């Protein structure tokens, strides 16, 4: 067989992975973080409380002046919050309801949205007509976009559930960059603060680190056990999360190229579905399965902090580019801000 | 002054609101329905590219919408948590190389025991018994050497066949549903229940059928709401 | 990373015996439902056996309900597919497939035609 002695390479360059992360792993982020001083209880109350979905909230995204977000709900809504005042601004409808992302794009002039139909629908923000209309829609796609980021104003990452992640041009409609290789459903995405590189995670149990103008998967993460729900990039730009459905979420490192540190507990069964870093990185917000959130500690591992103010599966969080807000939507059709 | 922008703002949320309102009013009426098929299943003809197919339809003032998933890969246990608010799954069985009906058995299995589909009640369409009807009676055995136990297994007493319907075809019609119901009837917990009916893509009922199920379902819902069962 | 290196297969007489045992590294066992399933020659990827994460719960296809016996050892990680009296219908890629989510009764998409929790595959050949 040709096959088997193709694989033959393939399993040899996997051993040689390997066994070269074996080499860079001379100390565990525990190590060095042993002697650090731990954050202590970090308890959030519940200030705000976004109540105007109707069916359960799949995904949420923050706008870059740390004021506006945007949710996505399975009624077929694409609301635009102000969170200072709980004042809906926009109220989006969306022609295919199942929704299952949503991105606010740093000009705040754009929204997207994505779901079952396979269609990312780009909404103008900023119309003299006197409503939000469809600026255009995205059908390259053969599956179910998961997760959407925008990186310009006519350039978006959508991620989606045919193993394919993909660059489009807004002006153009057309993709301009194809990411083929996850082998399972990209999940979600996440966006560098360089917006020159991202990590998505699929349901193979594997991040891929994506260079978005060369189009290439530069590292590959497979230190998880299941479905990689969740995703999202160090404040740094070296590092991102990842939540699974094996509760579990791993911090791993562009650099290191291998898993720095597992943060687990034996009260946590429960798929991963959102996570979050702060504006320094030092604590890492989680979504979890048991209707609350959990404030890891990315350096001590030890849980910091637990959100237990979500009626059902906490699907979605999100913290503001200052750090000051963490919204965090569920499927009880309720955002709240912590 | 920025009381001013403040006051408008304020306003916007008071036209939102009255526009949430009036959506409120059709999304609870209209019941959401996921038609989810086998493959093969003929779930096409049930309804007589894109990522998915709403269907529009009312039944005696009750509007419903089906949802077929067109494109979506056969890799279900991501968008399947989508459907956790639907009134009902209609699951197509395609009921006669591979074996379609196992694949169903299991396919039916991994939706009811799903964590987020606890409470979503599946009506099993049991599709295709005209190509059954055939597959039974002329020879051509494909549920005895598929299923083993079906030799031990005889037609239920209660049961009611169809005016001039051979028992061969009968049993072998029971037992595909007793055999979506043994995975019902061990993770029903009194939250969802299975509705199997026996349909065959020529039938013009089974949008009424639909109907008639999905009016037990809010009446277990709104059973279990007072906590009356 | 994820890994279901399955052991055992090969040609066999009809009515004779095989063992395959599947060596899932990569990941904590005994925690997930774990599968087996094949795809002969010129059909789809069809579901054989399943086995409980605690070993109680046990589940075959019609066509090996009594002749196949399905096992694991959570203290290994692996798992066993005690085969007997195999048929010529039984020459199939048998597929070692994991569960996707631990500590669950949900098993989805371990037929599918592409799922990374699934091995390699042995060529079990009846002839």
């Known amino acids: 067989s040709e096959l088997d002695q193709l694989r033959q390479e393939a399993e040899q360059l996997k051993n040689q992975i390997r066994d070269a992360r074996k080499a860079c792993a001379d100390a565990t982020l525990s190590q060095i973080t042993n002697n650090i001083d731990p954050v202590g209880r970090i308890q959030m109350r519940t200030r705000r409380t976004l109540r105007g979905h109707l069916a359960k909230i799949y995904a949420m995204h923050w706008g870059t002046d740390s004021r506006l977000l945007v949710s996505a709900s399975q009624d077929g809504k694409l609301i635009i919050w102000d969170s200072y005042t709980t004042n809906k601004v926009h109220a989006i409808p969306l022609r295919s309801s199942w929704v299952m992302t949503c991105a606010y794009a740093p000009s705040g002039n754009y929204v997207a949205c994505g779901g079952l139909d396979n269609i990312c629908s780009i909404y103008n923000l900023k119309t003299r007509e006197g409503n939000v209309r469809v600026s255009r829609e995205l059908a390259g796609h053969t599956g179910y976009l998961s997760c959407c980021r925008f990186l310009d104003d006519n350039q978006i990452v959508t991620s989606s559930g045919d193993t394919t992640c993909a660059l489009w041009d807004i002006e153009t409609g057309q993709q301009t960059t194809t990411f083929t290789g996850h082998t399972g459903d990209v999940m979600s995405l996440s966006l560098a603060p360089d917006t020159r590189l991202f990590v998505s995670g699929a349901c193979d149990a594997s991040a891929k680190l994506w260079d978005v103008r060369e189009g290439m998967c530069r590292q590959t993460f497979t230190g998880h056990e299941s479905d990689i729900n969740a995703i999202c990039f160090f404040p740094n730009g070296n590092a991102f999360a990842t939540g699974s459905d094996d509760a579990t979420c791993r911090l791993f490192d562009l650099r290191a190229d291998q898993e720095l540190m597992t943060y687990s507990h034996d009260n946590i069964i429960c798929g991963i579905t959102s996570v979050s870093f702060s504006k320094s990185g030092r604590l890492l917000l989680a979504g979890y399965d048991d209707f609350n959130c959990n404030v890891w500690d990315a350096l001590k591992a030890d849980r910091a902090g637990v959100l237990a103010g979500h009626d059902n599966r906490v699907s979605c969080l999100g913290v503001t580019d200052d750090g000051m807000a963490v919204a965090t939507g569920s499927w009880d059709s309720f955002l709240k801000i912590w | 002054d920025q009381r001013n922008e403040e006051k408008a703002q304020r306003e916007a949320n008071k036209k939102i609101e009255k526009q949430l309102q009036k959506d409120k009013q059709v999304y609870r009426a209209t019941h959401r329905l996921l038609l989810l098929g086998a493959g093969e299943s003929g779930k096409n003809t049930i309804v007589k590219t894109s990522g998915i197919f709403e269907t529009k339809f009312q039944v005696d003032k009750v509007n419903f919408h089906m949802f077929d998933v067109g494109a979506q890969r056969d890799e279900r246990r991501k968008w399947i948590q989508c459907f956790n608010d639907v009134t009902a799954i209609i699951f197509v069985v395609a009921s006669s190389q591979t074996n379609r009906l196992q694949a169903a058995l299991k396919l039916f299995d991994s939706i009811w025991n799903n964590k987020w589909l606890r409470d979503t009640s599946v009506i099993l369409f049991l599709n295709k018994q005209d190509l059954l009807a055939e597959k039974v009676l002329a020879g051509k055995s494909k549920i005895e050497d598929y299923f083993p136990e079906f030799a031990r297994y005889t037609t239920p007493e209660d049961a009611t066949p169809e005016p001039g319907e051979d028992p061969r075809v009968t049993r072998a019609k029971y037992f595909i549903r007793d055999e979506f119901l043994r995975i019902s009837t061990a993770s029903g917990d009194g939250r969802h229940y299975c509705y199997p009916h026996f349909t065959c893509s020529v039938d013009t009922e089974n949008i009424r059928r639909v109907f008639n199920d999905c009016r037990d379902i809010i009446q277990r819902m709104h059973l279990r709401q007072y906590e009356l069962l | 990373q994820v890994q279901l290196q399955e052991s055992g297969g090969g040609l066999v007489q009809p009515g004779g015996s095989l063992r395959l045992s599947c060596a899932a590294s990569?990941?904590?066992?005994?925690?997930?439902?774990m599968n087996w399933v094949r795809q002969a020659p010129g059909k789809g990827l069809e579901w054989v056996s399943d086995i409980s994460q605690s070993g109680a719960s046990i589940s075959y296809t019609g066509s090996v309900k009594g002749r196949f016996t399905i096992s694991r050892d959570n203290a290994k990680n692996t798992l066993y597919l005690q085969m007997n009296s195999l048929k010529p219908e039984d020459t199939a890629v048998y597929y070692c497939?994991?569960?996707?989510?631990?500590?669950?009764?949900?098993?989805?998409?371990?037929?599918?035609?592409?799922?990374?929790?699934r091995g390699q595959g042995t060529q079990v050949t009846v002839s």
């Open positions: 990569g990941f904590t066992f005994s925690n997930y439902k």
């Open positions: 497939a994991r569960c996707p989510a631990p500590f669950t009764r949900d098993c989805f998409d371990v037929t599918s035609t592409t799922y990374a929790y």
